[PDB]
Design a binder for this molecule. Structure first.
Ligand code: PLP
Ligand code: PLP
Ligand code: CA
Ligand code: CA
Lengths: 288, 288
């Protein structure tokens, strides 16, 4: 495996960025942390566009439907983006369900309103939507649900008794660091509860699952051999890149540490090793 | 390993029961299923007592403090028992916490009122008990919590940031079958959520953890070489027996199936294989 966790700089950086036809960016810990843009991140993106390089964005965040996601970008300084460049676990979960729901021509959702709006915009019928003056549930979708409860968990497991009812999770991120240094439970903790209580394994929509890449490649010809994958999370973004055959760059502004990446290297766990790293994605700009 | 999953009957049954000085019974799926006693179970216990054999009871149920547990037994036909014969994950979690709480001379609890009463009766201070006109949390205890919520999960994880704060679970049972054929999420699903979101591994109080046996042996001299362990759950009661060096008997009135036990045998997973099985514990009576 080519993954040696080398600091990317100099002529190698110019070489790597030169040959790349495109860049896939993970979002949180990469472009920004909370309400603060990573300094130099907007400029990197302006300069990518100008250098004729394709930029796409992949987030496991299931809380915003695409229109609200588009607004977060521009607001944090990332101007002139098309909404078609933005891929989240919410959008892709909606598409996956449209593609795989069984039965002849409803989804029980653990998640918020952004997630639900996204699902409705894809044409899906949700349990808890009004009746026709009581539709069979054919998928349980686990997303980020701040109103997760034991009753909703028991309800999910009830639907799951039917072995033809699908189980899908938006993502398995276990938690996410917040501004003040605290963490919030991720969808991966809710997924774990649903899986344990039901005895089922969930289908994962988001990184590090190939499906996300499948979802991105339906609208864009992107050559994985010529695309960089940039993220802050070893078990999510880096594993994802390796699985899609992309060159992976870990940035150190987010969840994972350089020492963790090196430890994985030492242990020969190569799919969890980035090909390159940078302190922040501001460092990629000089290679253009 | 001596675990061959043999049907226990005849002269072997008389031999096995003859040499045994005592019997440890798991409760649900063994003595009863819901509100219905297993026919012949009360008689088995009357006859054990009369044959001078010690009977003890081990349940992972964390919902009843001991006095309410004692009442469930008698009511379902199991008369003349001492409360000292009854061990649950609630009682033992209380003892474990009294023994291991750090700091110089409070517990955040996910669980119901039975569990809390048990903890208070052991002298423990609970978060959410009134202040002294705001005590440091030194353990998070995960029990069966029908009011589990995302907010309580985030709260648990907050306490768990402190690496000296303990994480304890009553048990990992994933779910439990109900009367009407439905299942209810178990503590194991809530534990899984807390562990995933915190990144911590919990200390498990109940079967199949040795601690339960440790807890039972503090008041009783029981020779594990001469004690039968009887239960309905391979990964809980049978594994538990093997770990405590007891002779294990699987009864088929509960969660696990004979075919699952045989499959484990076939795969050489010996700690998940009962030494013996019976259709119901009523079949043990004739060996006395
Ligand atoms: C609910 C949720 N999911 C996922 C993420 C992170 O997604 P990503 O880092 O892939 O952009 C966040 C980060 O805040 C989040 O809040
Ligand atoms: C919450 C809970 N825990 C555990 C159990 C079962 O415990 P055991 O089979 O060890 O007696 C039950 C069974 O109903 C239960 O409801
Ligand atoms: Ca990220
Ligand atoms: Ca049982």
């Amino acid at each position: 495996s080519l993954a040696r966790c080398e600091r990317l700089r100099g002529a190698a950086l110019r070489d790597v960025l030169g040959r790349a036809q495109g860049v896939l960016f993970d979002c949180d810990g990469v472009l920004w942390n909370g309400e603060r843009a990573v300094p130099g991140a907007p400029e990197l993106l302006e300069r990518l566009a100008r250098a004729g390089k394709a930029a796409l964005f992949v987030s496991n965040n299931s809380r915003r439907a695409r229109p609200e996601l588009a607004l977060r970008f521009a607001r944090l300084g990332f101007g002139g983006l098309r909404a078609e460049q933005l891929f989240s676990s919410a959008l892709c979960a909606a598409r996956l369900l449209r593609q795989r729901l069984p039965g002849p021509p409803a989804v029980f959702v653990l998640g918020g309103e952004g997630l639900r709006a996204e699902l409705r915009a894809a044409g899906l019928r949700l349990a808890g939507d009004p009746s026709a003056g009581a539709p069979r549930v054919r998928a349980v979708l686990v997303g980020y649900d701040e109103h997760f409860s034991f009753a909703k968990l028991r309800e999910a497991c009830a639907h799951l008794r039917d072995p033809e009812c699908l189980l899908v999770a938006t993502d398995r991120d276990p938690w996410h660091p917040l501004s003040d240094g605290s963490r919030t439970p991720g969808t991966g903790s809710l997924a774990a509860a649903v899986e344990t209580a039901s005895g089922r394994q969930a289908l994962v929509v988001g990184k590090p699952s190939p499906y996300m890449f499948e979802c991105i490649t339906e609208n864009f010809s992107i050559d994985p051999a010529r695309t960089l994958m940039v993220g802050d999370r070893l078990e999510t973004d880096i594993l994802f890149g390796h699985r899609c055959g992309m060159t992976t760059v870990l940035t150190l502004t987010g969840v994972s540490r350089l020492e963790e990446a090196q430890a994985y290297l030492a242990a020969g766990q190569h799919d969890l090793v980035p090909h390159y790293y940078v302190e922040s994605i501001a460092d990629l700009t000089e290679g253009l």
